[PDB]
Amino acid sequence: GSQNNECKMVDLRGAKVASFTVEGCELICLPQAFDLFLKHLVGGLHTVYTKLKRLEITPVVCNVEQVRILRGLGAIQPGVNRCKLISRKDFETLYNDCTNA
């Protein structure tokens, strides 16, 4: 299929996370990165979305195929049917805003 649906593990702050390259940009699984680095630092993906809006960052929406792959990889939980992706640079911007704004 199309290259945007091909997953690969990449490094993020010393950890491995799932990624898809969409529109020429390498994006990583937001919920997964959240669980790994902001689980307590902010507590709540709802807050992440709020901050992302303010930072003028609009996450890419995962298509059905990508969601299924992420669930299979354990990147997102079995009951999850929706997932968003953002660039590593944007995640760092988000991370900085949640911890050292």
For 44, the enclosing helix (H) or strand (E) is none
CA torsion sign for 42, 95, 98, 68 is negative
Q: What homologous superfamily is domain 1-101 in, according to CATH?
A: Ski (3.10.260.20)
Question: Which residue type, as a one-letter code, is found at position 49?
Answer: Y
CB 48 within 8 A of CB 30: yes
Q: Which residues contact 63 (CB under 8 A, 6 or more apart)?
A: 5
Residue 44, Cα to own-chain centre: how many angstroms? 14
Please provide residue 62's backbone torsions phi and psi, each rounded to the nearest 5 degrees.
Answer: -65, 140
Helix, strand, or coil (residue 97)? helix
Question: Which residue type, as a one-letter code, is found at position 80?
Answer: V
CA torsion sign for 71, 67, 5, 95 is negative
Closest CA to 77 of 27, 35, 14: 35
Closest CA to 88 of 7, 12, 3, 8: 12
Please classify residue 36 by burial: count the beta carbons closer than 10 Å to its beta carbon, then call 0-12 exposed, 13-18 middle and 19+ buried.
middle
- State the Cα–Cα distance between residues 82 and 85, nearest whole angstrom: 11
Q: In the chain, where are the structural domains located?
A: 1-101
